[PDB]
Design a protein around this ligand. Structure first.
Ligand SMILES: Nc1ncnc2c1ncn2[C@@H]1O[C@H](COP(=O)(O)OP(=O)(O)O)[C@@H](O)[C@H]1O
Ligand SMILES: NC(=O)CC[C@H](N)C(=O)O
Ligand SMILES: [Mg+2]
Ligand SMILES: [Mg+2]
Ligand SMILES: [Mg+2]
Length: 1298
């Protein structure tokens, strides 16, 4: 009923560098702005009053963030808020916090930014340009009063169903509805619906038509992939889908599920799966097969409109598909892909770049590469999966391709998200759905988001309208999805008692696709009640309820008798759920509305799900002639410089360190390699469990520009490069490697349809069967083109046919993986040239950087040799004969060699006289293959091994890696190219420099860049004060007496399992203690002598990282007392890591000896930092760091709010003089530092761990529990065994308890 809104003023919102960025942009647009100041403002919509104690609680909940200096407001107020009718994810999370702090009076919290602008003239026109700079027009609105925020909370009554009057108007009623609702129905679909509803004798409701329209969109139905074809006048025998399935028919080996779920599954390894038992709450290893699931998809349309949520929800949706595999499974690691047009970075424009214009209503390529990666990472970080491999291509050029001179590019981008997960053997096959099964929606209360995303993603970009653009603006709440994943995990961890009978993602078409798909897959019908669906928008129509594409939702069926167990599981995780229907024997779909007393849907399923006829595509081959590369302005030296400046080639740190690479404690090989943490790893590798060296690998291959000359060569190169990227990982049989094939095309663009067919046939009927590669999963995105008016003229930007191949494989031993990090021991560099001397230059980075396409591209030259290459590499890996590997891809041999020299921080001396007279072609061709490094004494044996696989004539001794800074390429006695390695490495870094500079704190960006120019940097290096191998806990463990540790987690924590496992190894019984367990009386801290607060994103860090977790404790007097009691005991030990460190810092008042502790706030860079950082252990009372003082070693860092902040210099000095600092960032020279990224977060005096006066409580931002295994350390000394130095923390805890 009646509500009231409270306004609570917040903290200053913008740091000085962001304030200056705005002032410079106003200056640059001739807007005389003299000053700008911004404060956060909070809006609390209340359903009943707060007493003084409750109000002070709310005020305290709304104190967070860096303590920037406050100003009295002056000048003109512009308030930026979410647009009315939308609810921010901030609101969802901040409101949860208020509820878990016992403020049930809060209906909703929302936040805005109040800007105060002091300006000169400014016409009201100039005031609109000011407002335009301060907000995102796709998600936010600008208001002139704080009281205008009342508009965000308006109560709306439910809108009724609308019927479409077929009986009273005939077919015209359907034609009109088609246009009005944007159904995009073909004529034969209108005929089908006309007849269906004629036969039923009643008018269709809007909801029924909309549901049908989204289900029959290209995006949902895959008509092109199921079409018959005629090509150059000849009917073809197979659909594209069937050509793909041919690879499964040929190679079924190791596959457990293909084309039957939203993920493929393959065999894994029998290992210890580590999780907490349902009955005891104790973490234990369960020895069993951990099979491997895989999936890759895209989110291309929405990302062109709103890239952050487009990227974020692309990850989100893919992660739902993984979790919804079989009867429930567990996402493990991600991959990420982007293809965009030229960046045209201001002040850093490159010579191949020309501005060709774009639609007004899509964003730029730069804006996609700025906001998009941050959204994808935001999801992966908050959900808690590491992101370990990826690609990033730029391409935008006017080229003479298959359809003559045209603009080819990515104005509509590729935004790709994928991953692998683990699954139990008895959960791979979907279960049957019993009649009477309860049909549940797990996850977030819905809103009117993304409505018609199925149809909207089935058409070209540009030339839209405002309403369809708003409907392309997605919304992500990763913490909601983590809560759901926890429920799914509890389910599958019940084994034979998993109550999930069937589960599926909620994606395109929303419930309208997902619920009918679910009952249909079980051979049932369903009857549903509209008003049982959770809603955050009471105004929605039945059509909006049923069809919206709100995020973080799953559908599942459970037996009625398992509902009480399901409800327990949900409530413990705080995962919202609703029973919304029942499965029926009758194959009918009914949706009832208790509010309006009527029946929005009443359809037989065969009517609803029936199909118009199959498509037939009758198309013609076009083939580009292609022109020899004009080398007039090309020199080797200039080409080097340009190629290292192509983003596709250039260093990718901007995309890498924004995303967590260590969550789970199972990451063995991330993108960053070696002591200088250079992002060149060719594939990702994870361990299968926390107790095994078996694992999983991921790689990507893609080569779209090649499809501008040769469709089939492009698809063969994508598969070949996926293989050459994975090949130095210990796999064995090539049939263990499984592919996802993701096809992006502008279907209908001249030449592309035939090209697509040819390319699918090239890999599905030919190459993959001949190699023994299965493609058990895949997807397609068939409208990769953008049209707009540029002056008086029509313009179009069409993508090349763009196949992205992801490769997945069970790994036999993760320890044996090679990287590009050159050794300088005596060595030989050998090139494996799978190009057989073809040395093609067409559609290379070289061609692109001189604005050309060239003549003939690379291609798979010899299938047997490609297989022999793989098998030879597997032989060399297993026999431990390789020091290094790096494959050849974008940028050619030149770039492979350069990148190895960068990773090894060394030089090379190579001769290319054997690779042909054309040195430009030898160095810049992008033929398959790469460079191995071997010990000099092994050269002859390695060459004989290669020869056994038929490769002798492709193998060429190049030379050696050498200490120092010289990169030298000779041919006989001539120097072909010679340059400082450091100069080349800096050039190769300039793209990430400029991206980080424009996106992050430019001071940090500059510091990181400039460090790369100092060749004397020794890289990460270790000094140990103790014996890493000495298990000081062993005598305790040998008694069999295992003390408990409370492994504490809140909603949104994601780092608890590996924390449990670290303590386990040290001899503890690790107990899963959720904050709901404490609030419910199921666990009491009095039964524990040790507690650990784990990492993650509790409440999505809304209201300050760790703050909602801590304030939930403080505001419940019972739980508050419990924690105080624990910390005031004389012998108890507690550890807070990352989110747990932040939480415990906010609980100071309960912890003795903590009065000098700092706060932890937004990093100085203004960016999430996923780093492998060097720290030193400093002298303090900390009992957990005993024996380790003076040690220096690297550790996993993964945080956005890790900066120590003190009240004033007095506080810093007091802390330091008390001697409570326990860890500090050091640079690679070993000195305490504040320079970035050696110190990733800007903490004064490098501080990143503190302890209490008694030593019994220690808090730290880095993650020792992610790196307690040597194998999980991105770089480490070669002589280490199983345990890293960090294992000593947990062993210290065990010894301390006695
Ligand atoms: N979009 C991205 N997100 C995350 N990591 C990425 C991304 N693009 C590239 N990377 C990573 O950066 C490194 C270099 O990428 P790239 O040069 O494209 O690989 P390659 O040439 O071996 O195919 C790799 O470790 C790759 O996984
Ligand atoms: N991994 C973590 O615990 C991170 C803590 C918090 N979400 C941050 O980013 O600062
Ligand atoms: Mg590369
Ligand atoms: Mg590579
Ligand atoms: Mg690549």
């Amino acid at each position: 009923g009646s509500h009231m809104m409270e306004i609570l003023r917040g903290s200053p919102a913008l740091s000085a560098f962001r304030i200056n960025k705005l002032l410079a942009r106003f200056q640059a647009a001739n807007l005389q702005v003299h000053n700008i100041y911004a404060e956060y403002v909070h809006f609390a919509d209340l359903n009943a009053p707060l007493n003084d104690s409750e109000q002070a609680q709310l005020t305290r909940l709304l104190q967070y963030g860096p303590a920037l200096s406050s100003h009295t407001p002056a000048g003109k107020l512009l308030l930026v808020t979410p647009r009315p009718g939308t609810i921010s994810p901030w609101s969802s999370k901040a409101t949860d916090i208020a509820h878990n702090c016992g403020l049930q009076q809060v209906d909703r919290l929302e936040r805005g930014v109040a800007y105060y602008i002091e300006a000169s003239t400014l016409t009201a026109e100039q005031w609109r340009q000011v407002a335009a700079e301060l907000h995102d027009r796709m998600m936010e609105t600008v208001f002139s009063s704080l009281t205008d925020a009342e508009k965000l909370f308006i109560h709306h009554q439910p809108a009724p169903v609308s019927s479409v009057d077929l009986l009273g108007e005939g077919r015209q009623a359907l034609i009109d509805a088609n246009l009005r609702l944007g159904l995009a129905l073909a004529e034969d679909e209108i005929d089908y619906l006309q007849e269906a509803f004629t036969k039923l004798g009643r008018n269709p409701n809007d909801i029924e038509l909309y549901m049908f329209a989204q289900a029959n969109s290209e995006h949902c139905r895959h008509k092109i992939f199921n079409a018959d074809w005629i090509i150059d006048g000849k009917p073809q025998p197979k659909s594209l889908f069937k050509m793909i399935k041919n690879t499964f028919e040929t190679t079924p080996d190791y596959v457990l599920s293909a084309y039957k779920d939203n993920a493929a599954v393959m065999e894994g390894s029998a290992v210890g799966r580590y999780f907490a038992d349902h009955n005891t709450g104790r973490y234990d290893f369960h020895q069993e097969p951990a099979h491997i699931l895989m999936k890759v998809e895209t989110h291309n349309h929405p990302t062109a409109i709103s890239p952050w949520p487009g990227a974020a929800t692309g990850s989100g949706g893919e992660i739902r598909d993984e979790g919804a595999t079989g009867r429930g499974a567990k996402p493990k690691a991600g991959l990420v892909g982007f293809s965009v047009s030229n960046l045209r970075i201001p002040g850093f424009e490159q010579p191949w770049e020309e501005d060709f214009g774009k639609p007004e209503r899509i964003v730029t390529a730069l804006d996609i590469m700025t906001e998009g990666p941050l959204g994808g990472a935001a999801f992966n970080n908050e959900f808690g999966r590491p992101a370990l491999t990826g690609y990033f291509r730029t391409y935008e050029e006017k080229v003479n391709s298959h359809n003559g001179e045209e603009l080819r590019g990515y104005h509509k981008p590729i935004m790709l998200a994928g991953g692998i997960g683990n699954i139990r053997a008895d959960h791979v096959q979907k279960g049957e759905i019993v009649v009477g099964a309860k049909l549940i929606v797990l996850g977030g209360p819905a809103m009117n988001i993304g409505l018609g995303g199925g149809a909207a993603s089935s058409m070209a970009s540009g030339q839209s309208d405002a309403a369809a653009d708003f409907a392309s603006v997605q919304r992500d709440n990763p913490e909601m999805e983590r809560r759901c994943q926890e429920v799914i995990d509890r389910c599958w961890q019940l084994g034979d008692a998993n109550p999930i009978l069937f589960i599926h993602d909620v994606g395109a078409g929303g419930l309208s696709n997902a619920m009918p798909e679910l009952v249909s897959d079980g051979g049932r019908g369903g009857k549903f009640e509209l008003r049982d669906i959770l809603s955050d928008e009471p105004g929605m129509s039945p059509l909006e309820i049923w069809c919206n594409e709100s995020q973080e939702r799953y559908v599942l069926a459970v037996a009625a008798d398992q509902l009480p167990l399901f409800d327990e599981l949900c409530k413990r995780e705080r995962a919202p759920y609703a029973v919304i229907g029942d499965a029926t024997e009758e194959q009918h779909l009914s949706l009832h509305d208790n509010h309006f007393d009527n029946q929005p849907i009443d359809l037989p399923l065969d009517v609803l799900l029936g199909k118009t006829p199959k498509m037939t595509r009758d198309v013609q081959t076009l083939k580009a002639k292609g022109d020899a590369l004009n080398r007039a302005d090309i020199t080797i030296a200039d080409a080097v410089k340009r190629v290292l400046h192509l983003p596709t080639v250039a260093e990718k740190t901007f995309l890498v360190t924004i995303g967590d690479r260590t969550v789970t404690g199972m990451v063995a090989r991330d993108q960053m390699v070696g002591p200088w943490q250079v992002p060149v790893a060719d594939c990702a590798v994870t361990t299968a469990s926390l107790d095994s060296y078996y694992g999983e690998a991921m790689s990507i291959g893609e080569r779209a520009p090649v499809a501008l000359l040769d469709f089939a060569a492009s698809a063969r190169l994508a598969v070949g490069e996926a293989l050459t990227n994975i090949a130095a990982t210990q796999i064995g049989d090539i049939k263990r490697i499984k592919l996802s094939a993701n096809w992006m095309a502008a279907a209908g663009h001249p030449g592309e349809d035939a090209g697509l067919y040819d390319a699918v046939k090239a890999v599905g009927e030919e190459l993959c069967p001949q190699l023994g590669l299965t493609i058990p999963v895949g997807k397609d995105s068939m409208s990769m083109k953008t049209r707009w008016q540029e002056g008086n003229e029509q313009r179009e930007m069409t993508s090349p046919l763009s196949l992205v191949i992801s490769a997945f494989a069970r790994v036999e031993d993760v320890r044996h993986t090679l990287t590009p990090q050159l050794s300088t021991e005596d060595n030989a560099l050998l090139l494996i040239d799978l190009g057989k001397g073809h040395n093609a230059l067409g559609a290379t980075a070289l061609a692109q950087v001189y604005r050309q396409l060239g003549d003939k591209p690379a291609d798979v030259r010899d299938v047997a040799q490609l297989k022999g290459f793989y098998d030879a590499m597997q032989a060399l890996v297993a026999a431990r004969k390789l020091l290094a590997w790096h494959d050849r891809s974008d940028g050619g041999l030149l770039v492979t060699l350069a990148e190895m020299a960068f990773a090894g921080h060394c030089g090379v001396q190579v001769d290319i006289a054997a690779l042909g007279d054309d040195h430009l072609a030898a160095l810049f061709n992008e033929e398959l293959g790469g460079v191995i490094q071997v010990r000099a004494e092994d050269r002859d044996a390695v060459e004989a091994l290669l020869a056994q696989y038929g490769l002798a004539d492709c193998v060429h001794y190049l030379g050696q890696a050498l200490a120092g800074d010289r990169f030298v390429i000779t041919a006989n006695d001539q120097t072909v190219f010679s340059e400082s390695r450091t100069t080349l490495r800096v050039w190769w870094a300039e793209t990430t420099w400029q991206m980080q500079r424009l996106r992050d704190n430019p001071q940090c960006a500059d510091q990181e860049h400039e460090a790369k120019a100092n060749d004397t940097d020794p890289g990460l290096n270790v000094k140990l004060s103790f014996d890493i191998n000495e298990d000081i806990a062993a005598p305790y463990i040998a008694t069999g007496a295992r003390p408990k540790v409370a492994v504490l987690r809140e909603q949104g924590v994601n780092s608890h399992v590996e924390m449990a496992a670290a303590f386990h190894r040290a001899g503890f019984d690790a107990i899963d203690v959720h904050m709901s367990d404490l609030l419910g009386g199921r666990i009491g801290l009095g039964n524990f002598h040790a507690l650990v607060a784990c990492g993650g994103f509790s409440y999505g860090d809304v209201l300050g990282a760790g703050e909602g977790w801590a304030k939930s404790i403080l505001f419940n007097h019972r739980v508050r007392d419990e924690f105080e009691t624990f910390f005031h005991r004389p012998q108890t030990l507690a550890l807070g890591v990352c989110n747990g460190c932040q939480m415990m810092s906010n609980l100071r008042e309960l912890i003795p000896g903590s009065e000098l502790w700092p706060r932890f706030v937004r990093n100085h860079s203004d960016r999430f930092e996923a780093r492998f950082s060097l720290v030193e252990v400093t002298q303090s009372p900390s009992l957990l760091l005993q024996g380790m003082v003076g040690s220096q070693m690297p550790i996993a860092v993964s945080h956005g709010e890790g900066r120590v902040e003190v009240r004033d210099d007095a506080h810093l000095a007091a802390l330091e003089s008390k001697g409570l600092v326990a860890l500090r960032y050091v640079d690679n020279f070993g000195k305490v530092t504040e320079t970035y990224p050696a110190n990733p977060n800007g903490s004064p005096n490098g501080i990143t761990a503190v302890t209490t006066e008694n030593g019994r409580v220690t808090i730290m931002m880095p993650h020792p529990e992610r790196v307690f295994r040597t194998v999980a350390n991105s770089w480490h000394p070669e002589n280490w065994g199983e345990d890293s130095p960090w294992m000593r923390i947990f062993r210290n805890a065990r010894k301390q308890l006695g």
